[PDB]
């Protein structure tokens, strides 16, 4: 049989890849780091509390001005908040209540959201007529949407429940690039700061580094045991962090092509729903479902803080572009800004 | 505050008022989750109730507003979106009786009932169970035995004793029988008792939720 020979060709290619990235491993990140000073104890207080949602919220995204944020929940509302004064700038009603993702455009003119209706809806905020209306319906993706992220005001990459990612152009509505290669359905997505490439994490226990302009997978990252729910880039764009259902977060390189460090402790048995980095990338914040967020020293794998202000599952979190604050939202219908 | 911040706070107060007004009328409606295997009579159930990822059907019955979610057409990993339906009032689970000896289809129906009925998110949720095709079930009992599905079965096969065996074989699947209540109904393509059975099972959950609202749990 020729297909057994082709599967063995795939097996010796995997053995060559595994030995090639075993060859580069001369030191861990722990042995490079641990001479330097620890972060200490991070004590972050609930500076604001945004309370207008009435169901479980599933996503959040900060603005680029670090004052505006968007929040999406399961009562069919995404609310745009002023974070400084806790004023509700906008409240956009949804066509479908089942929404698992939201994004805020870097210009600030649009939001996007999506969920179990297979569609990334895109809404125009800076309208001449005063209200927020639907700018685009992005359909054709045959599985629940997991993540939407704007590149520009015309380009958005989406993650779906049908093992595919998709680069769209907004003004035509057409899926201009399809990113295939996952075998379990893909749950998280994160854009590079120079927006040339992105990373996506799936139920394969694998993350894949894609390429927006060319259109196909550059590197594959393996090492988790269960479904990985969260992914985020380091601010240099040379590393990224995953968080899964293993009670583990992990760090991976793009240039060294290996596992860097596992952020895990024995007391956590439950999953990770969200990750994001600080502005310097020194501390990684992970949202959990033992109801509280953890602040990890990303270089030394210590626990630096616990953000414990929620009494349901922390579903989403995010750090400002200033680095000034952290918003964590949760299944108990409350956003908290911490500082 | 400034003269412009005061109108911002007044905008936020009107937005708070609209959010309370919508979220207090989304709490007086009944959310139902349709489940079942492919070709298990769910389309006929939507037909009898009402007269590309999720299908939402709206109907009213005895001054009660029902929103019913068919999620069966979305074919992916169920464990990554089933916690979205925590807080659904009742689960309408549809099993076709006449798909017993087909390819064995009852064992995937029982596997789906064992997966749904013992989920951590639906630990308290009542499960209405519609056994869907009895008129073809009697015509297939009169030509074929029930021992294709169940080698351990030993009973008379006329109309009423095999169907009770299917009902108790589905009812035995939960490890917990006291936390949730399973409501089993026998239906055809032509009967008008189905939505009344739905309303009668919903009214018990409404009574328990009203007692939880008034502090009794």
């Amino acid at each position, epitope marked *: 049989s020729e297909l057994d020979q082709l599967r063995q060709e795939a097996e010796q290619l995997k053995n060559q890849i595994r030995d090639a990235r075993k060859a580069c491993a001369d030191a861990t990140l722990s042995q490079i780091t641990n001479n330097i000073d620890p972060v200490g104890r991070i004590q972050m207080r609930t500076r604001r509390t945004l309370r207008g949602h009435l169901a479980k919220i599933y996503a959040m995204h900060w603005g680029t001005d670090s*004052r*505006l944020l968007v929040s999406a929940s399961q009562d069919g509302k995404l609310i745009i908040w*002023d974070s400084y004064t806790t*004023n509700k*700038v*906008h409240a956009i009603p949804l066509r479908s209540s089942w929404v698992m993702t939201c994004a805020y455009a870097p210009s*600030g003119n649009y939001v996007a959201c999506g969920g179990l209706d297979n569609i990334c809806s895109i809404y125009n905020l800076k309208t*001449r*007529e*005063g*209200n927020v209306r639907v700018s685009r319906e992005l359909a054709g993706h045959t599985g629940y949407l997991s993540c939407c992220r704007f590149l520009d005001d015309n380009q958005i990459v989406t993650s779906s429940g049908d093992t595919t990612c998709a680069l769209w152009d907004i003004e035509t509505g057409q899926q201009t690039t399809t990113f295939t290669g996952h075998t379990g359905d893909v749950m998280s997505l994160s854009l590079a700061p120079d927006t040339r490439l992105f990373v996506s994490g799936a139920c394969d226990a694998s993350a894949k580094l894609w390429d927006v302009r060319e259109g196909m997978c550059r590197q594959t990252f393996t090492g988790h045991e269960s479904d990985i729910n969260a992914i985020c880039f380091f601010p240099n764009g040379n590393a990224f962090a995953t968080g899964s259902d293993d009670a583990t977060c992990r760090l991976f390189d793009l240039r060294a092509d290996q596992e860097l460090m596992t952020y895990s402790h024995d007391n956590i048995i439950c999953g990770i729903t969200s990750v994001s980095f600080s502005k310097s990338g020194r501390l990684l914040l992970a949202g959990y479902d033992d109801f509280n967020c953890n602040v990890w020293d990303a270089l030394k794998a210590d626990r630096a803080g616990v953000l414990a202000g929620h009494d349901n599952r922390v579903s989403c979190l995010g750090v400002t572009d200033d680095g000034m604050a952290v918003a964590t939202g949760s299944w108990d219908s409350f956003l908290k800004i911490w500082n | 505050l*400034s*003269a*412009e*911040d*005061k*109108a*911002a706070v*007044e*905008r936020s*107060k*009107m937005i708070d008022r609209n959010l309370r007004e919508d979220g207090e009328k989304a709490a007086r409606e009944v959310k139902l989750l349709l489940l079942g295997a492919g070709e298990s009579g769910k389309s006929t159930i939507v037909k009898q109730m009402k007269i590309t990822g999720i299908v939402e059907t709206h109907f009213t019955f005895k001054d009660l507003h029902f929103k019913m979610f068919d999620v069966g057409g979305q074919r992916s990993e169920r464990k990554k979106w089933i916690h979205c339906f925590e807080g659904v009032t009742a689960i309408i689970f549809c099993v076709a009786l006449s798909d017993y000896d087909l390819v064995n289809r009852m064992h995937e129906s029982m596997k789906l009932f064992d997966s749904i009925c013992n989920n951590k998110w639906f630990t308290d949720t009542s499960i209405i169970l519609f056994l869907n095709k009895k008129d073809l079930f009697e015509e297939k009992i009169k030509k074929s035995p029930l021992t294709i599905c169940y080698p351990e079965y030993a009973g008379s096969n006329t109309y009423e004793e095999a169907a009770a065996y299917i009902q108790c074989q589905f009812e035995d699947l939960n490890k917990r029988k006291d936390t949730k209540e399973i409501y089993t109904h026998f239906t055809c393509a032509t009967d008008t008792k189905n939505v009344q059975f739905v309303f009668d099972a919903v009214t018990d959950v409404i009574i328990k939720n009203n007692l939880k609202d008034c502090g009794l749990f």
Partner: single-chain antibody
Amino acid sequence: VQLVESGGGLVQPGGSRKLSCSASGFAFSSFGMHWVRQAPEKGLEWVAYISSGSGTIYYADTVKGRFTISRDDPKNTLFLQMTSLRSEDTAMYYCVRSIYYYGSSPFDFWGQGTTLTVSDIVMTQATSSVPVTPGESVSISCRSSKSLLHSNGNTYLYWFLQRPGQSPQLLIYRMSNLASGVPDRFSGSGSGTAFTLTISRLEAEDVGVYYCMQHLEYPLTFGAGTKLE
């Protein structure tokens, strides 16, 4: 966006009139509304303000007690009711759309106005009229009595422009921020109480009277006017 006013005509002293303004093309139920006077030779003066959903109503001190504002959210019309019409009310009135959230542009869309002839912080326009050679940079200054810089960071100074025979429009809201539909010729700078509009590379449809208004506290007070020739 379309705001058209009605209720014109001459009137006796001591008379009454209900001016109206029909709105269409925008979400009128979420806009705060204003009325703003212009005398036939003097500049602009603010009349009255109704908020979104009728919860906050302000008047000017020269109109407090006599005038009455009323909005109709389903039918999309805004009324101003007169009683005891003095000889200081022989003017042309403009209905002003505005909206207030973070980053919004209030005072951006103005009506065509209507005529009716009856038969604080002070603003100083630093030059009454400037002769203009086209293509050159033009600086127009304005002065307040109080500091307009609030403690949040905003500077409530609103630079407008009224072309001859035309309605006013917003050029630079909140002392520095360019309005939508206005080119990068126009700019606004300033400091504590001293303000400077800049018109670099001036072209046609730029002649007309310029106004500086403030929104730090009520009443809203305009400048005298600065005509370019």
